[PDB]
Write a protein that binds this ligand. Structure first.
Ligand SMILES: [Zn+2]
Ligand SMILES: [Zn+2]
Ligand SMILES: [Zn+2]
Ligand SMILES: [Zn+2]
Ligand SMILES: [Zn+2]
Ligand SMILES: [Zn+2]
Ligand SMILES: [Zn+2]
Ligand SMILES: [Zn+2]
Ligand SMILES: [Zn+2]
Ligand SMILES: [Zn+2]
Ligand SMILES: [Zn+2]
Ligand SMILES: [Zn+2]
Ligand SMILES: [Zn+2]
Length: 739
């Protein structure tokens, strides 16, 4: 039963014949160093031994990236920041953001930016941090978190994390496999999600990356929200099933007496994101920005949106991250009638994070804040000081704060008696508990050579390729006089436009003319082609946005922000009276804080999204004409190319529905011979299905509209379009198949 032990600074101590690590270096087996004691008794013994700064340092989590020594020429070295974070801020949680991949020959360690690190180099970096954490007085280990890594970027061998379709494609593939085996498409064949999660957990754990910022349980019920690209589905029951499988596969199925799925077999502890559900954004605008503070619920579906989180809580998820949106007129769950959650950001609401999440939904783990939101994105708290903002989060129930690297911030709060020592301790118990249950006090190191053998292994990449082929959804397969168009015929001339690699397409045995020409040069005609292959999407370009510019945010010609958030002080929040200019909600204009010349929080729309006055343009014709949207390749070119072939049924459209884009009848895109929704796949996965080596089997995990009107006109918290006039062009569950 002796758990494997690894110490590279502290000494191994024996007692009762068994072995242990002396992380305190007292020479005695302190109870917290005893792996046989129950974990609540271990933490009780360790928190009793820590100073307030040490316990306050657990409430911080910040970026700690691998570094490169420009003279040593070695990658995977501790950066400067590590010593400060570990020994002075007493931090034990970090975000790992380096890309893991094999650098090309000629890559020199330019001391600038986050270097690309190989799997073995990441593992050595993570081990180094763990060793510094072992050198700490109480040698508490560290935990790294990361955003998702196993997904194809649809706008871009061993060594990198294995590549799967985007989250929505995982849902599409799961639905399609249930449909193939039972003819139905509702809650999905979670065997595909467990197969995905099994690759990720293996590769993540092998580099010492035992935590995640994710996955996202948010529902794609509002199509104008730019974050729909990171959601699995619009259907809460499918998402809840996905969240349950993710937790059971990435964390164990072994739940402790405290209800948390945490064992030494936990490969990745999850921090579910955007509780209680950031999907229903008003006008699709996102809370990262002052104009988009509001989350509205016209169909009364607030309970449906936290349903996925419930199933993950019930499965034993380790951590929860609250969003920064303001619930507007949401009936408090388990409360007297007429009561509405305070018009304050969830990240600051004691009633959501302690009441809804902990008391009503039963959550026993710890709560982890989001980044870049506590100091300058405290909605409902624009009048407050920055320390008051921080105390509202912590007393509201948030235990660790993301993007904070100065422990003096917490102790200044405790000194100013804004936060209690009892709180700093309750936080410490919740934050220390997973480090014990996951076995990190016994062995927090990983073997770097095994990382080379694991990250991107041949079988792992085969599973991702499998899911890519199964994630494609055939939306339209016109039947010619000759027969179906998509099972492509062997041989023929083929015109390509968009992100097709010409040689991989030639390699299937086709003569290919390449429509993708530089801007200046001339583009060959598509006349004569037997098939036209177009891979198309749309992106934002909002980087010019300035809130205080009279041309932009203060431009009356751009209309007014129709969103109204009435504060509990009874006066509207600045700029959110329903009658202000789009840039009026930003602090640099309202200036309702304790800083004289506050900087704008929305300028450049750094995080994504369109110009707010354009966030309802999701049809391709409109996007082509909009200022902050771009169709790629331009819809003008697509339409020329579709004219040059005298039959539009020779056009195959591969569309990446980053949001639920509208194939309007004006665009002509619905006259193509075939239309497919892709969520990220290699060119050979795509050509495999189009050529009939594999048949398409995936189903849409969110409905698609056919009218600009249905987009404006659907309920932000409701899935589908059935409540709209024009309705859904394609519903959830829709999937054609080669017959
Ligand atoms: Zn000891
Ligand atoms: Zn100190
Ligand atoms: Zn294993
Ligand atoms: Zn279930
Ligand atoms: Zn976030
Ligand atoms: Zn005091
Ligand atoms: Zn080894
Ligand atoms: Zn081993
Ligand atoms: Zn493997
Ligand atoms: Zn040829
Ligand atoms: Zn032209
Ligand atoms: Zn035709
Ligand atoms: Zn909706």
């Amino acid at each position: 039963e002796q758990p494997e032990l690894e110490a590279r600074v502290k000494e191994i101590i024996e007692v009762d014949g068994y072995q242990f690590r002396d992380l305190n270096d007292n020479g005695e087996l302190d109870p917290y160093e005893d792996w046989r004691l129950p974990t609540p008794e271990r933490v009780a013994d360790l928190v009793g031994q820590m100073s307030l700064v040490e316990k306050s340092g657990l409430m911080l989590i910040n970026t700690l990236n691998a570094a490169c020594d420009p003279q040593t020429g070695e990658f995977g070295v501790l950066p400067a920041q590590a010593d400060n974070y570990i020994n002075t801020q007493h931090m034990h949680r970090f975000v790992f953001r380096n890309v893991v991949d094999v650098r090309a020959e000629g890559v020199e360690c330019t001391g600038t930016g986050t270097p690309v690190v190989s799997p073995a180099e990441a593992a050595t970096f993570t081990n180094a941090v763990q060793e510094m954490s072992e050198a700490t007085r109480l040698g508490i280990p560290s935990l790294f978190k990361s955003n998702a890594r196993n997904h194809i970027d649809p706008d871009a061998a061993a060594g990198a994390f294995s590549a799967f379709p985007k989250e929505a494609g995982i849902a599409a593939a799961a639905l399609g496999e249930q449909a193939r085996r039972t003819g139905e498409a509702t809650t999905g064949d979670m065997s595909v999600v467990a197969d995905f999660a099994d690759v990720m957990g293996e590769e993540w754990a092998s580099i010492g990356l035992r935590g995640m910022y994710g996955y996202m349980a948010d529902l794609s019920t509002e199509p104008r929200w730019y974050r729909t690209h990171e959601t699995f589905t619009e259907d809460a029951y499918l998402a809840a099933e996905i969240m349950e499988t993710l937790v059971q596969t990435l964390q164990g199925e072994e739940l402790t007496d405290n209800g948390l799925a945490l064992s030494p077999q936990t490969r990745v502890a999850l921090t579910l994101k955007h509780f209680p559900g950031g999907g229903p954004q008003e006008l699709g605008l996102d809370p990262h920005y002052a104009f988009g503070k509001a989350q509205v619920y016209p169909a009364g579906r607030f309970e449906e949106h936290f349903l996925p989180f419930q199933a993950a809580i019930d499965a034993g998820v380790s951590s929860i991250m609250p969003y920064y949106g303001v619930p507007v007129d949401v009936p408090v769950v388990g409360g007297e009638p007429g009561e509405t959650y305070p018009h304050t950001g969830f990240a600051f609401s004691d009633s959501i994070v302690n009441g809804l999440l902990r008391d009503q939904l039963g959550f026993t783990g710890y709560v982890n804040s989001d980044t870049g939101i506590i100091n300058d994105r405290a909605w409902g708290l624009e009048g407050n000081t920055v320390p008051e903002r921080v105390a509202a989060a912590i007393n509201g129930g948030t235990d660790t704060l993301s993007g904070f690297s100065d422990v003096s911030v917490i102790t200044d709060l405790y000194e100013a008696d804004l936060i209690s020592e009892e709180r700093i301790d309750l936080a410490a118990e919740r934050l220390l508990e997973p480090l014990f249950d996951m076995g990190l006090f016994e062995n927090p190191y990983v073997d770097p050579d095994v990382a080379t053998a694991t990250v991107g292994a041949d079988d792992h990449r085969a599973v991702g390729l499998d899911l890519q082929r199964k994630s494609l959804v055939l939306l339209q397969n016109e039947e010619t006089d000759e027969g179906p168009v998509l099972p492509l015929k062997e041989g023929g001339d083929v015109y390509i436009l968009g992100d097709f690699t010409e040689e991989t397409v030639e390699s299937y045995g086709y003569e290919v003319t390449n429509g993708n020409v530089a801007e200046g040069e001339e583009r060959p005609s598509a006349a004569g082609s037997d098939y036209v292959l177009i891979s198309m999407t749309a992106k934002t370009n909002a980087g010019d946005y300035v809130s205080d510019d009279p041309s932009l945010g203060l431009n009356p010609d751009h209309g007014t922000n129709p969103s109204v958030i009435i504060g509990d002080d009874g006066e509207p929040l600045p700029g959110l009276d329903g009658q202000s200019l789009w840039g009026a909600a930003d602090v640099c204009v309202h200036k309702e804080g304790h800083e004289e010349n506050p900087s704008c929080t929305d300028n450049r729309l750094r995080f994504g999204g369109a110009y707010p006055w354009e966030s309802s343009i999701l049809d391709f014709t409109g996007m082509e004409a909009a200022e902050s949207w771009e169709v790629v390749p331009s819809l003008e070119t697509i339409q020329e190319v579709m004219a040059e072939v005298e039959d539009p049924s020779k056009v195959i459209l591969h569309v990446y529905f980053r949001q639920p884009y509208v194939l309007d009848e004006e665009s002509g895109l619905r006259d193509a011979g075939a239309i497919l929704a892709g969520f990220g796949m290699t060119d050979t996965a795509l050509m495999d299905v189009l050529t009939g080596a594999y048949a398409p089997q995936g189903k849409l995990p969110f409905a698609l509209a056919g009218t600009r009107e249905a987009i404006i006109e659907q309920d932000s918290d409701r899935p589908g379009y059935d409540e709209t006039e024009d309705g859904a062009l394609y519903p959830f569950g829709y999937g054609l198949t080669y017959e």
